[model samples]
Target chain A: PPGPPGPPGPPGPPGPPGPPGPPGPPGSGYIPEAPRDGQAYVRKDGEWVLLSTFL
Target chain B: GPPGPPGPPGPPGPPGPPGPPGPPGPPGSGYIPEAPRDGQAYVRKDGEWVLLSTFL
Candidate 1:
């Protein structure tokens, strides 16, 4: 039964698929060491950067 | 009811329970805004001021 508002309509018109995004740049050439490295510093891009200078 | 060897039924309930993306950062410092005002800026010292820098 219709209440104050009727049932919502079907899904909206299918939006155009977004344009193919440019290929991501080759990751920051630096391949960070794995967590095994222990004293890993997390990077802004959600990556781990090891600081050899720090203990 | 004798539990039969559990067989995978409906799509496995949410993947095994799991869950911040970054590790702790060295200390830093900044000013915080108590109220909206002219020339208002907030600089937070990483972990020390977690609330201000993020999720404000």
Candidate 2:
């Protein structure tokens, strides 16, 4: 037997982002270990950041 | 299947200079009146090139 069209299903939750995780340039190969304090590393944004935490 | 045994250790390699940095993307916007190189600005990939990010 035929029945009335079912009520529309509620819309699904907005999809998760098309991709996971923040996006940016790769990390620069610089470390700020002791004896190398105040060294620099390229951030994901392609900008240089000085590490002062070692001070 | 059974797990395979670990392979023998390999010889060490001579130290070398650090690898070059990631390739910087093309700079500011412009529409080329002449033909442009592939993967270059105003070039086609899946579609027209759009600004992705900016670097100083």
Candidate 3:
């Protein structure tokens, strides 16, 4: 019979990084696209950016 | 359990000339000059590893 120890769970809202749905074209040789939830595929000078817009 | 379909494109292997020539000649931070080109994963020089690319 215990109580008092549960108050801290309400801080997860502030995201909006859409507009990048154009990747799904792969049938040649270079295959690299596996991001859907938040988006990720950064490389820089090498190329392959897509980190939700390369934040 | 159904993954096995990727084999039909063998005939292009002739690009190996940019890797041997950096055994000792680097004293500016050093990054290996920039050799490697296929996965690039080699770091066991121990001596701190000096230049190893800037070849001809």
Candidate 4:
């Protein structure tokens, strides 16, 4: 008595194209030299900590 | 002796072709300047290093 459930077996072949989306978040290596209104640095280990001038 | 009434869902499998543009994000380290002592005077704004001095 189960002969009417054989018409929904043709949509099980479309799931093999979803594996390429992981590599887009790393762009800030360098390029920012514009601050001379009252300069004030402080890096410590990397170098660049000159802050003296009545400030 | 009573089971036959569930067959009408086979027409929704044709939408898998839109995923090929995710391989370009790893090249942004263009600000490495901090090794020229002799008075010290930086200025790199966004990348860090803003030590000019003379703020009176």
Which lDDT tens digits does candidate 3 get at residues A8-34? 444444444443443343232222343
Interface RMSD of each candidate, angstroms, one decimal: 20.8, 25.9, 27.8, 7.0
| Candidate 1, TM-score of its B chain | 0.16
In model 3, the runs with Cα more than 4 Å from the true position are A1-28, A43-55, B1-37, B40-56
Tell me the whole-model lDDT of each prediction, alpha carbons only: 0.34, 0.34, 0.37, 0.56
Q: How high is the TM-score of chain A in each model?
A: 0.25, 0.23, 0.20, 0.27
Report the error of model 1 at residue B8, Å. Answer: 48
Please tell me which predicted candidate would have the highest lDDT against the true structure: 4
Tens digits of per-residue lDDT, candidate 4, B11-49, equal 767767667778989766545656457787754444455
- What candidate 2 gets wrong by more than 4 Å, as runs, is A1-3, A20-55, B1-56
Give one digit per residue, the lDDT tens place, for model 4 in A1-55: 5545445556745666776877898776344334344456444444445454224
- Candidate 3: the clashing residue pairs are B22-B52
- Per-model DockQ against the true two-chain complex: 0.02, 0.01, 0.01, 0.36
Report model 1's TM-score to 2 decimal places: 0.16
> Each model: TM-score of chain B?
0.16, 0.21, 0.20, 0.30
Give lDDT tens digits, candidate 3, residues B24-51: 3324453323323343222224533222
The true-versus-predicted C-alpha distance at residue B21 of model 2, in Å, is 16
Q: Can you give the lDDT of residue B35 in candidate 3?
A: 26
Residue B23's lDDT within candidate 2 is 59
